[PDB]
Design a protein around this ligand. Structure first.
Ligand SMILES: C=CCc1ccc(O)c(-c2cc(CC=C)ccc2O)c1
Ligand SMILES: C=CCc1ccc(O)c(-c2cc(CC=C)ccc2O)c1
Length: 256
């Protein structure tokens, strides 16, 4: 029983390493200076210098919004390739595969975003850049309101000190939520998640002797993430009153 759960964990970790360009391990090493330093964007001048220097003519707030929008669409492709590696996922009905992805990707994006963040800012362009929390806040309304709730989540989430092995299972649990609207076959999804949760619980016990509360804390974080997405899509709704990506538009119309 436990041997199969450890096999699941390893399979997910190996797939995780394949699917995502920058792991938390590599991100924290860059953030602590335990490695070539990223270009720091902290004001308008450094933003322009960063755009020329970093290998990635409109209004600054819009330019940053567009780049982040396009990074989000790349993120969903990465998550989709990871999802297909989760044992049993591809055996699900295709309509349920896409439904789980649509309702789940943004929760996963903000989960993994936390790996790139500290209290001072966020790693961008696969660790080549570092954009400060206060610079993002200084952007004109309502663009300055986007990242702050993510930073707020990240500092609390990062205090849990999860590693890539923990996160691989955590994100798999989130993708396979049987309570997403419009699901055709709930039972096979619940079966997979129950096994992933067992694997998660075992992983946390072995990997984190310093805390017996982690599993419960992580369940709490899963509900918190749903609130972050809801806040994000509502802030996206008021921007309809100020070039939105069509793929994201399709995801949002289900989320509204
Ligand atoms: C790794 C994915 C990239 C990612 C992650 C979280 C995010 O909140 C955003 C994001 C940021 C802004 C703020 C810029 C003005 C606007 C829209 C967004 O979608 C992008
Ligand atoms: C001017 C910079 C706008 C810009 C352009 C391309 C990018 O990929 C990103 C980027 C954004 C986040 C989310 C944090 C805000 C994470 C990773 C990234 O790489 C940002």
């Amino acid at each position: 029983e436990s041997a199969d759960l450890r096999a699941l964990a390893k399979h997910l970790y190996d797939s995780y390493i394949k699917s995502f360009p920058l792991t938390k391990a590599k991100a924290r090493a860059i953030l602590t200076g335990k490695t070539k330093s990223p270009f720091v964007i902290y004001d308008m001048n450094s933003l322009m210098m960063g755009e020329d220097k970093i290998k990635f003519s409109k209004e600054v707030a819009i330019r940053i919004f567009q780049g982040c929008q396009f990074r989000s669409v790349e993120a969903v492709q990465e998550i989709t390739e990871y999802a297909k590696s989760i044992p049993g996922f591809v055996n699900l009905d295709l309509n349920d595969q896409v439904t789980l992805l649509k309702y789940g990707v943004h929760e996963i994006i903000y989960t993994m975003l936390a790996s790139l963040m500290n209290k001072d800012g966020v790693l961008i362009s696969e660790g080549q850049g570092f954009m400060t929390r206060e610079f993002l806040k200084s952007l004109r309304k309502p663009f300055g309101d986007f990242m702050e709730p993510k930073f707020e989540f990240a500092v609390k989430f990062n205090a849990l000190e999860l590693d890539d092995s923990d996160l691989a299972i955590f994100i798999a649990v989130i993708i396979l939520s049987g309570d997403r609207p419009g699901l055709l076959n709930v039972k096979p999804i619940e079966d997979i998640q129950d096994n992933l949760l067992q694997a998660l619980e075992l992983q946390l016990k072995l990997n984190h002797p310093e805390s017996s509360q982690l599993f419960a804390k992580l369940l709490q974080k899963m509900t918190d993430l749903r609130q972050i997405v809801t806040e994000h899509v509502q802030l996206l709704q008021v921007i309809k009153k100020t070039s939105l990506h069509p793929l994201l538009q399709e995801i949002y119309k289900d989320l509204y």
